[PDB]
Nucleic acid binder design. Structure first.
Length: 49
DNA sequence: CGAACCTGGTCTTGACTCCATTGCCGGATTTGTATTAGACTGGCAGGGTTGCCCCGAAGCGGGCG
């Protein structure tokens, strides 16, 4: 929660996945956001092995 | 018993004053409408965190002509 910004939440749902809901609208997985910052899949496995 | 009175109003008549009420009539003001020729070309921007309940909508896994 910031001050006067936009929220973002990283949950773990009923399954073994991880919605990354960004600004109140219909969830997400992490990898869309990690690649959206510019992390390759190898960098994802490297950071999260 | 009558004469004369003077006074209760009762009402009218005429003369005079005042005053509203239109009626023009002109100036003040008030409201509407139109017109300005260099070019100018897709909005800010904010909030929002309760909880529970009922119901209806969109979707995903499941089978099938």
């Amino acid at each position: 929660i910031p001050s006067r910004g936009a929220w973002l939440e990283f949950d773990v749902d009923k399954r073994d996945t991880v919605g990354v809901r960004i600004d109140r609208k219909r969830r997400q997985p992490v990898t869309v956001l990690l690649k959206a910052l510019g992390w390759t899949s190898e960098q994802i496995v490297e950071r999260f092995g």
